[PDB]
């Protein structure tokens, strides 16, 4: 314990925090790279900013701090506040909304032999670009840029101790599971800036449980489209005709909107639901459009028109060929029937290659 | 006082101290650490965000040969306080923050008694996160953590040690939407890249439900009940639609109503939305069969109108369930046919519902 | 003022800042408190918190702080930052989402016997239990601790210099007015701890003044809570009998939630007008199921069974009772009209009866 | 620069210079502060939360006998920078804070003269709380201030002058919302429990109404009319619900998004609203009257169809307005007086309204 | 390294260098710092909000003779990193803040050569306020600029340089909303109280209108058109008040969705939302001709039907047009009279609107 102090003492009598420390001037610090994220925590897509908590294990060497542990009662691993030794500026190029890096700066330890291991917490909030497309499906490559800043490969140069990102201190609970978390090690010329400058670009790939949004945005939405078709079946005579279509269109606007407030408001892809559920909306307004053209023409039969060879093409060629005062207004009431029918076959057809579309992907 | 000045500057002086440096007599020796944890009050359960708001204090022990005195030399002097800042403390934190300070918030000052015993409890507010297992919403225990560690000393110079398995109560304002169940703390032991000391204090908590079950259950209860009355309507009032139209929507906006509160985690299934959602295609299915009745009854002229499906509905049907007017009395039938269906189906879905938590 | 730098020198030439001043080890400092509310700004309902702006005029001595006022050019009173002089560690025990106490540490009074006057401001976030029942005119008890910490009633004990809570530079500018601020001086043993350990609880109490809520939340709601019996009145062969309905029960419930989301989500009481809202729905689905029930045996008369004493209790014994093809169809017609007014008795008596219910507290 | 390392020694070598005491040349003589504040931009008047977020440098000035020089004695220097944090400043700060930070936030180097006077203005964002007086929405003019004191020093020590009345709009970013109309400032002299000198900066804005104008104003206007319209169509349609309805919710809509944007005071009421509220009274008891109507119309058997009743609605109203069949026209006739009424009495209101802006 | 620890201890050592003094060889001489400015993303352009996030390497050069040295006296060292805040550095700062953190990020070491030039680059996270120019929703172009200025010196001790017109896009990460146009960079001067030197980026972004030219102009487009249609529906439906109704809503709904997406000023009027409101106007002047139909419509016994106002529908507008059934005519006439207005009117409007940016 005394040792202990007095060992402090012999360390820090003439240390220099500010001195690049080796032995030689052209010899280069070695500075190896453990990441062990602690949580996952916010994935707003909206912002394309992701949230994680994270341990940057950072281990290098000082010919400086060394010493010989029977000299000192066999100790031969002190912890020492890391604010006095010398440490490597790593720091995150893909920052948003927070800190750069190493806010806490907590204790490392120091081996005999000089080597310092660091294992600081902190909160990083990571940008990442957000795609869209199969929603919720969807799995996302976020990456985490950890690069040394003044120093150039010349002076420092990252080690990936892992490969894999270190999952063994993981807080599982998310509506995300990880599909893998790589460590990339590149360098780089920066076009400012004369030198090579090294980084360690961190993906996570994560998958969506989409069992959340599978039940409170895709299956509502799902049974109301349903709906669109069915308009034209109803009798023009209800008075229900238009009724029906106006919720249908709203309420798919409201999911398409609300969709729309939760993706990220890119323009690099279309979401495919929202794609949906705006080719829906183009169907439903037309739809809307003919319902209201199939009640004008249905109801009046004085000083109409009622040219023969158009109601032959209605009564007397269509309605077979699909298959396969009365006497002028019921004239229209098959007629108003018959372009109904027409088009249930003309959107219940087409619906379904929309669909097919939709599920060309899996297909 | 006066001589408080003097005990204090011997023994902080850092000629004496070196706060840097952990008191163990050997380096062989480990120093344990007493650790009991005090509510105040539970402050939120963020349960979208997964997170558990608490002020606590969390009285630790520990003590330092370097810290002692004869009361007789100074004025018999017993205890005295010092800042903490100052004297070497074991690094006792957090390892469950969410968007979190991993230590303490006050730093209160700590109190020393003449033989070198330590007893400090600084304030804080945590921010700790847990899973939160929502089924049966509102009537859900969550089993809430946190995990005190310190996060400098490995199992080797520091030791962690319980004054108490339940949490302190002591001076809780017990007023919360949640009730305190149970309040246990264990000791963990594990070894990882190197060996350490886990503290869990456990937070099981059952929220009052009084709340959700008026202004949640109740309205989205009573709109349910509106999905299969819609049938009854005759379809001459022209309203079949509009009954219908309103009881979905109004299931949805209640089913994104509690999306919103719930966690929007996939682990399980709120069971309350489950209900709410399968009523819900209930009626969407509802309502194609509202829209083919319809068609059926207004239009006589040219109908196939086919006997053998007259018969089964009007001769076979009719009295199968009791025990173009004709037209309208088949809208009639295949209607309440669905009735006594949805009727079955809907009372069967509940009862198969409420076998779930029973 | 070369006298005002040299009483500092002589002043801070061997002061302790860590040591607890007094002449005797047994006597106490006296420390004294007015509370000077600066502004309530915040009295959040939903998360049961209440952001005020304070200063916390604390008063207390020191031996070790006295001179002579004719031995420095009669300089009486000096100015001190606060951060090198002793200090009492005044915190709030009801804190939440914000620090205890004393973050802007400002400048201190000493005069020359050696006492010193301390009013720093700070902003603090009390957590009050916010009882909801008649809103908006609510009167609520928020408390604010202030007491020692690490000192116990032997070494520190405290006095108040009011009972009133100070509004002299208050900001009036509020929904709410101040009805009266007590400051109350209580001692206790905390279960941790052996000692005595005193503070100071000051209870805010607090009237919402309700002209807002009252606008905007009640007078529509009963506006719309009127149209619930009126459904009855309207003839079942308009075709409206239910798009009254519909909308009643559907604005009601949006009042209903728009009002859950404004209260504190406890189960501690019911929000009267939430209950009174919740009410009104249950009687409003009722009139649903009624007015359809009314529409169903309304239409149809072919096939119909009539059974003589149900058409005999509407038409011939109930009609009066109350007062005091189309034969058979227009039967249906009265009938209808008979269940209807029945209900509308029902709903119009129970209706006044629970808003008598309601106004049980102010009769 | 060489010679300025050395001035800047001589005058902040402790020796000379200590900080923490007040530099004026007898105790008796006090201290006199100048006080001028700079707009760089408005940036945000939140109603809702009653708070100005604005950008601000204040010039401070004052002169200390301390930090003199003679030219000649230091290489013609006639003005020096120096860290503010190492120089005694007087400690003036908002006394107005919402969420404040009271003091300025980055603390700028001061420029000195070589007479000893000193220049100082920090850049600070400050959240100053106002009582918004919302009536005549969105054309109101908001009388919003500003305390600035020192928090230390009272007029004893201390005392504070104006370079300005009008507050300098010098580099002033002019697009807001918001016109500067005019920006004074007061001294203000009162006894406390001690005496203290309060300078008071007014900012009176008007807001650009414009924005409001279109998608708050016209809307509810639009929608207002309709109010009356619903009597007009007949009962035979069925839609005298439906629209009658429909024009109470979207105006309860209006009042409530307005509500959320206003500040939840009770001191006055938003005149919009006031007139959007007293419309909606009359929509509601619109909406009784047309059910009214529907009933007196669609039934004639077994009908009381009191001739009195009968005689002066028919053959008394009919032309007193004008100047089962008549069972329509007792219905029509009922309508058309309420519609007279509602005519009247809306532009009664309207005139009512206006009346009070005016 | 050693030699390293030798040459950082003469360079600051406080007996050799004065932080808080600005090096110049003479005070004549003026020092000299050239700024550049590097984008590596552009985060956030809150429109709402008018703020721009983004984060920004700021290249700051000068030079300093009290940091020279001798190679050949310490191991040939070309170069040495130092921490920014023991050196001297010109306090060049953000104004243009709202919320702002005037000074960057991250206070990275800076690379200093033996000639004593200084090279200095820091992170920071800058929330630049511009007014946001909405007009051409979504496809507009926004000029957002940032003021980088020393608060401390002015134009006699401290003058400021561009290496470059065009910020530095080296290291950006494209995927944005909006497109980077051009980012040119100017010098300024101008005399206020003091002679001051200004630098200002401006940066000119392209949205890609992409998203909400789907999400937002597609389906209000869609129901735009709906507006027209209302008329062509018979009367006799009893739907033309709902259908007129349902439009009605949605388009305030969207104008309000719109409201809440652009920022509150009365600047200028956002397109979209100026047509938007415009066509709205059209469908409630269309809700009131609607209803004046129906009343024309439902009603024959004790009409004044008088005959030169049913020859001038009847006999005389139909035909001009098309080159109790008497009452559905005139209904039908008096319909399609404002239908063909209408048609030509959105048409004409819709061509007078898409003029304007044409
Ligand atoms: C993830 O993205 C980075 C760059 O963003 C890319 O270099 C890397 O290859 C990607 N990795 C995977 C697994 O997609
Ligand atoms: C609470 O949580 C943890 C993990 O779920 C579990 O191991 C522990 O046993 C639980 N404690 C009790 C008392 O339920
Ligand atoms: C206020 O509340 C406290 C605790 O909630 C209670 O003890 C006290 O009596 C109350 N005081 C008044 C004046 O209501
Ligand atoms: C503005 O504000 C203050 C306080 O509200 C008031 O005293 C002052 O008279 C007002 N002055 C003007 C010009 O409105
Ligand atoms: C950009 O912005 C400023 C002010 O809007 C203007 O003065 C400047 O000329 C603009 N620059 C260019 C290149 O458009
Ligand atoms: C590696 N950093 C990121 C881009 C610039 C470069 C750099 C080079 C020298 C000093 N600081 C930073
Ligand atoms: C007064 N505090 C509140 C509860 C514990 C007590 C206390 C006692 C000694 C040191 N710190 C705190
Ligand atoms: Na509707």
């Not at chain 1, 087409?350 to 097919?356: F, I, K, M, S």
């Not at chain 2, 205890?79 to 303490?104: F, Q, T």
């Amino acid at each position: 314990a005394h040792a202990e102090e007095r060992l402090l003492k012999k360390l820090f009598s003439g240390y220099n925090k500010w001195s690049r420390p080796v032995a030689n001037i052209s010899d280069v610090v070695l500075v190896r790279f453990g990441l062990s994220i602690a949580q996952l925590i916010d994935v707003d897509e909206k912002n394309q900013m992701m949230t994680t908590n994270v341990w940057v294990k950072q281990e290098w060497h000082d010919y400086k701090l060394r010493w010989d542990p029977a000299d000192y009662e066999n100790v031969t691993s002190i912890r020492i506040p890391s604010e006095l030794i010398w440490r490597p500026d790593i720091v995150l190029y893909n920052n948003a909304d927070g800190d750069f890096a190493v806010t806490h700066l907590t204790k490392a330890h120091l081996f005999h032999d000089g080597r310092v291991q660091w294992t600081p917490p902190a909160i990083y909030k990571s940008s990442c670009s957000i795609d869209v497309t199969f929603f919720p499906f969807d799995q996302q490559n976020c990456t985490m840029k950890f690069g040394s800043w003044t120093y150039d490969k010349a002076k420092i140069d990252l080690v990936n101790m892992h490969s894999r990102v270190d999952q063994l201190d993981f807080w599982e609970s998310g509506e995300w599971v990880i599909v893998d978390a790589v460590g990339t090690y590149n360098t780089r010329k920066y076009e400012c800036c004369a030198e090579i400058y090294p980084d360690i670009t961190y993906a996570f790939v994560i998958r969506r449980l989409p069992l959340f949004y599978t039940i409170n945005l895709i299956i509502p939405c799902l049974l109301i489209s349903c709906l669109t078709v069915l308009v034209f079946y109803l009798p023009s005579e209800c008075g229900e005709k238009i009724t029906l279509c106006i919720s249908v269109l709203l309420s798919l606007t409201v999911f398409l909107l609300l969709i729309t407030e939760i993706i990220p408001s890119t323009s690099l892809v279309i979401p495919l639901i929202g794609e949906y559920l705006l080719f829906t909306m183009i169907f439903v307004t037309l739809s809307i459009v003919i319902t209201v053209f199939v009640l004008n023409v249905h109801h009046r039969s004085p000083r109409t028109h009622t040219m023969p060879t158009w109601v032959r093409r209605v009564f007397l060629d269509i309605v077979p060929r699909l298959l396969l005062e009365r006497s002028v207004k019921e004239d229209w009431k098959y007629v108003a029937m018959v372009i109904d029918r027409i088009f249930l076959w003309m959107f219940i057809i087409v619906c379904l290659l929309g669909t097919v579309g939709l599920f060309l992907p899996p297909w | 006082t006066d001589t408080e000045e003097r005990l204090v500057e011997h023994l902080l002086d850092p000629s004496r101290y070196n706060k840097l440096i952990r008191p163990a007599t050997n380096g062989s020796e480990l120093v344990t650490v007493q650790l009991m944890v005090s509510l105040a009050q539970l402050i939120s359960v963020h349960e979208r965000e997964q997170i558990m708001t608490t002020n606590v204090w969390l009285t630790q022990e520990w003590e330092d040969y370097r810290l002692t005195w004869k009361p007789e030399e100074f004025d018999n002097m017993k205890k005295v306080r010092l800042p903490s800042k100052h004297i070497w403390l074991p690094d006792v934190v957090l390892y469950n923050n969410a968007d979190g300070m991993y230590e303490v918030s006050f730093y209160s000052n700590a109190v020393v008694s003449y033989d070198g015993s330590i007893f400090w409890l600084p304030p804080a507010i945590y921010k700790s996160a847990c899973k939160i297992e929502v089924k049966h919403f509102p009537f859900d225990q969550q089993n809430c953590t946190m995990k005190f560690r310190s996060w400098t000393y490995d199992r080797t110079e520091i030791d962690l040690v319980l004054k108490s398995e339940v949490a302190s109560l002591d001076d809780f304002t017990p007023s919360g939407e949640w009730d305190i169940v149970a309040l246990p703390g264990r000791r963990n032991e594990n070894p990882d890249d190197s060996t350490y000391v886990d503290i869990t204090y456990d937070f099981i908590i059952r929220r009052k439900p009084l709340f959700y079950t008026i202004n949640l259950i109740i309205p989205c209860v009573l709109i349910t009940s509106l999905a299969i009355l819609v049938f009854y309507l005759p379809s001459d009032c022209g309203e079949k639609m509009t009954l219908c139209i309103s009881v979905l929507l109004a299931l949805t906006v209640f089913l994104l109503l509690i999306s919103k509160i719930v966690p929007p985690t996939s682990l399980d299934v709120p069971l309350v939305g489950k209900y709410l959602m399968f009523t819900m295609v209930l009626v969407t299915f509802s309502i194609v069969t509202s829209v083919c009745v319809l068609n059926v009854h207004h239009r006589s002229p040219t109908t196939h109108t086919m006997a053998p499906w007259v018969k089964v509905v009007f001769l076979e049907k009719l009295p199968a369930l009791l025990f173009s007017e004709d037209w309208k009395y088949v809208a009639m039938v295949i209607d309440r046919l669905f009735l006594w269906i949805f009727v079955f189906v809907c009372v069967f879905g509940t009862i198969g519902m409420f076998l779930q938590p029973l």
